[PDB]
Subunit: 467 residues, 3 copies
């Protein structure tokens, strides 16, 4: 109900209180509690304080991280160390005798999102033997293993497939590990992942084709090839994947400080609240000597809206400033590896405001054509009479396309068919528009007309017009 919304704010308020409470535990300056990198330090400290082999990506039961401080002049890094069980202690009292890890996960989503915005992860994509071409499909691949079910929501088709192929490989040529106890422990790990990916697919032929891949005990090369095929297909006939807007702990923090009652107001990760919130919020970042603060700003705003693989046009359109392609950006990662000191770096306010707001979908657009097409298509002569013998020249020759020696042959062909139908400008979401921020409900949807300025669409593509 609005149950769903009051329990979402429950857990966001969770973060807020926590962060705030934490912020004095380090006596961090007011101004320093807003600094993004100090926030990430903290977030990944709570997660570092709750895992063992999952969640968060010379050591006891402690956990530290670089913490920055502007002191009588420049910035400096004071990496610290805290007791997990001491941090564990807070979270709970800030969440009322519970931990309701839903909070924990929310954060570790934001991190991924942020990452999907930052790191063009081609190098890993080849090792799997799939195509670097496929960034758009790799959502939340930086997601830790065993990551929350509602975290598997985020993962894109490409993210998932990879992971599976990764097991098939450990299976095909490495010690046959569906052979007994583990044979079932890590066969179900597999069986379920296929359905989850099966779950995300739009067309039925794709789903129909995921089954064949799952019904193969001791699966191998044919199966891994099938999965890449399936992965490619997802570029057009696209997968329905979630997109949640998740902010740095500090935003939620200052929000709570300024007096927001999140359990009163409720929250949704797909609605207005995240935009509203970003509008009224200041968050600083450090910037490397030769970097562009504006571009840092873009990077984070993108991250904040899981926007990494969105048509740059719409992104720029909602944003109110041109959102720029990845290789043209004048920035590296938000986080600062301990090499570069911090004598060089200055800090800066990040520009995270938007002109419009829009609703985050869990969809993939449209993808279909015909129910089962049952027509006869050709002729069988009965009589000895001179005449041509008709046949559907085109639909017949298309039937032989993508044919294969395996049981996915005509399922592949079907995709190829359905794929060929499509065109780069079949409209989707027809009707649904953006919103003025005053418009709190959905008064006026604004559909945008896109013989516009940018004209270029992909964040991780290649040049043609610059900046």
């Amino acid at each position: 109900a609005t149950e769903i919304r009051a329990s979402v704010g429950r857990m966001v308020g969770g973060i807020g209180r926590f962060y705030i409470q934490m912020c004095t535990e380090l006596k961090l300056s007011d101004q320093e509690g807003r600094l993004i990198q100090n926030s990430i330090t903290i977030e990944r400290m709570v997660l570092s304080a709750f895992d063992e082999r999952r969640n968060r990506y010379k050591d006891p039961k402690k956990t530290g991280g670089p913490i920055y401080r502007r002191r009588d002049g420049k910035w400096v890094r004071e990496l610290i160390l805290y007791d997990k069980e001491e941090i564990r202690r807070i979270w709970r009292q800030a969440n009322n005798g519970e931990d309701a890890t839903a909070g924990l996960t929310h954060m570790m989503i934001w991190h991924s999102n942020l990452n999907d915005a930052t790191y063009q992860r081609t190098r890993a994509l080849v090792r799997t033997g799939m195509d670097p071409r496929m960034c758009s499909l790799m959502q939340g691949s930086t997601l830790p293993r065993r990551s929350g079910a509602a975290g598997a929501a985020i993962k894109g088709v490409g993210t998932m497939v990879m992971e599976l192929i990764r097991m098939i490989k450990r299976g095909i040529n490495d010690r046959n590990f569906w052979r007994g106890e583990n044979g079932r422990r890590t066969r179900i790990a597999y069986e379920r992942m296929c359905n989850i990916l099966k779950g995300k697919f739009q067309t039925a032929a794709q789903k129909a084709m995921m089954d064949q891949v799952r019904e193969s005990r001791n699966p191998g090369n044919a199966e891994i090839e099938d999965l890449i095929f399936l992965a490619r297909s997802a570029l057009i006939l696209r997968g329905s994947i979630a997109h949640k807007s998740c902010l740095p702990a500090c935003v939620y923090g200052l929000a709570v400080a300024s007096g927001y009652d999140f359990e009163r107001e409720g929250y949704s990760l797909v609605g207005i609240d995240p935009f509203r919130l970003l509008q009224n919020s200041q968050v600083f970042s450090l910037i490397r000597p030769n970097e562009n603060p504006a571009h840092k700003s873009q990077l984070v705003w993108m991250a904040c809206h899981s926007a990494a693989f969105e048509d740059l046009r719409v992104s720029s359109f909602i944003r109110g400033t041109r959102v720029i392609p990845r290789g043209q950006l004048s920035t590296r990662g938000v986080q600062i590896a301990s090499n570069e000191n911090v004598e060089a770096m200055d800090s800066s306010t990040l520009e995270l405001r938007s002109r419009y707001w829009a609703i985050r979908t869990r969809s993939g657009g449209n993808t279909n054509q015909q129910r089962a097409s049952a027509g006869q298509i050709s002729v069988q002569p009965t009589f000895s009479v001179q005449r041509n013998l008709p046949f559907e020249r085109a639909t017949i020759m298309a039937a032989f396309k993508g044919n294969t020696e395996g049981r996915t042959s005509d399922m592949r062909t079907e995709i190829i068919r359905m794929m060929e139908s499509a065109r780069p400008e079949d409209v989707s979401f027809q009707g649904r528009g953006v919103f003025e921020l005053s418009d709190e409900k959905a008064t006026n949807p604004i559909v945008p007309s896109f013989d516009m300025s940018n004209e270029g669409s992909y964040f991780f593509g290649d040049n043609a017009e610059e900046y």
Copy 2:
């Protein structure tokens, strides 16, 4: 010789006498002996009276069926029961101390034919995992198992392939049944069917490709996929399948009553006699309240000439009235399931005459191109001299089409090549025309010009212009 023709009439006369003799055994009215549904009742009673596990599709050694009677008013159904050995008794005395089952089979052909005209058997085609697209190829699929060798003549390519795939399946994932005794009993069942289908194929590359499919003990997915490929191919490069004209027992019956001496005159199922015969013959049918007698007429005439998958143009052209597409017909099946009573139904004369007659082929048209094309096609530079390096851009790229990881790769490619060559209006049977019914021999062939009226070709296709 005309031996072949005098022994064909021997067995048709067979039917005629029988039917007649049978007709008084039920004292069926004169008018009632002509009714088609009463004829089918009888036909399938003789077959019901001769099988055990083949031929014909609360019970002793008997056999009955719905028999209809117009009584002092409307029609009514008087389903009966007879002793097989009593029916068995007649057939033989009507065939002179023999049964010469050639008769038996002839009938069970007509039934199939009739069925190929009536039932769009898509639902079954999917279960096999082949394409509903493929009606034209499904001739005599309604044919019972173990059906006569000269009944396997009728079967189309699609009918056959299905049947095989059906065994391969019972083989791949169901108890390995080529493993010993049955291992050979039902491996030869298989080995022979491939050759029979191999037999029907036109091109050599197809035949060449059937072999590879047969030479595989314990055959599976690759083989079943190969067979569908082969099945598709048969839509264009088409299979040579028989087409025999086979009438209801009653036609042959009244013919004999009216004094035809079939052994004197002889018969052929591919010549004039069937048309001649249909011309001079009346056969009534019952018709459901909201049905079109004309359309019933068409359905049966089609059935009577194995015309179900013929270009509607030629069919309409021979017929003398427009033969209409299947979904546009205002009728259901000829047979009446016992649900609908017969108080509603009236009967009607069926219009089975034709304007012209034509010769029934066992061919599939033309299909070929080149003997083995041996040319060099590219260049290997010997010298360091600046210049382009020639090559057959098109014939090379075509070579990579339909390539496969299996031993049918370039055999597939070859088909794909030969298939692509073809065009929906390569003329076939060049020269052979239709005939005026007076023209008893082959005086004047009439080749038809087909920028005509209908313009639409397939009986089981989809709309564009209606009725």
Copy 3:
């Protein structure tokens, strides 16, 4: 250094002395020492005198062959017999206490070359199940087994692949012969051949694809299919294969007689010396009654420059007369089978001069495109806003081409991609030209302009304009 050149002449001079020394051992007329067929008799006598199961393609430790003699009138054949160890004896004394088989091999190269010029070896290409289409790739297939490493240099891609498939076959369905001792003796025979062929390939994707073929103990149908695919690909994206100019022993012979000091002057099989040499040399051949001496001349000149698969244009261009297609030639083989007597045949001077000379490459032209193309190519909607969803329609659909159920799928696709890029007139060797024979070094390269006369390119192709 010029070490490389002084040791090449060492071994050519080898041949020369030998031949000469041999020529008096038969007291062969001066005029008869120049006759080509008598030279081949001798060459294959030395090789016949040095092998057991390799090198050279009712008998003791002897070796003879048809030797021809013009006697007081016509020509006649005096087939002889010599002791291997007697011939063995000479070669060595003519090569100074060594045999330096490098000579032996040089000859057995010329023979192959000659053969590649003469015999359109389609009949064998089918038996392997590869395409007759593929002459251009079959260099030195007539090469004996175990033929010298620097003889494997000559072999083209097609020659090689065949040989492998030939083992795979003896492997797939014939007694599993990688199973133990031989299991490794003739598995390494295999492993090495893949690398040698791998070695010859231009693109990396091809090489990358040869590996997968090699990493398969007990390899079969999938592998043999992979190799043909690879073979086809070599028609466009062509293989780097050596081309050495190797003359009949007699040329080298008369050269030495006339006083050339080959160890003084040095030799190269890729430079000017072979042309220079051919210019100043007379060599006679016998000609069958209905044959064209000019065409015999062409055949041998082609053979002499490993030119059999060269663009006829360049060949004619260097040659100075039109080099004619194979089926249009008015000659059969150089060698005379003992059936046809020699009463009919006359002899003739062969026209082996050239207008220009050019440098023999070991290259295959150009073949490439892009380093790893890493771009994003499509979009994943984040927001519910009405708009089309962009994607690279063409580069995506091309990705599904040549897909396969095997681990070479996208390696195949990659080739298909790279192959499609190409065009029959991408120039290669850009800059490198021919040479006037006076021009001893590389003063003036002559790049030829080829809107010329012939316009037809392949030696073993099919008609369009004749002679």
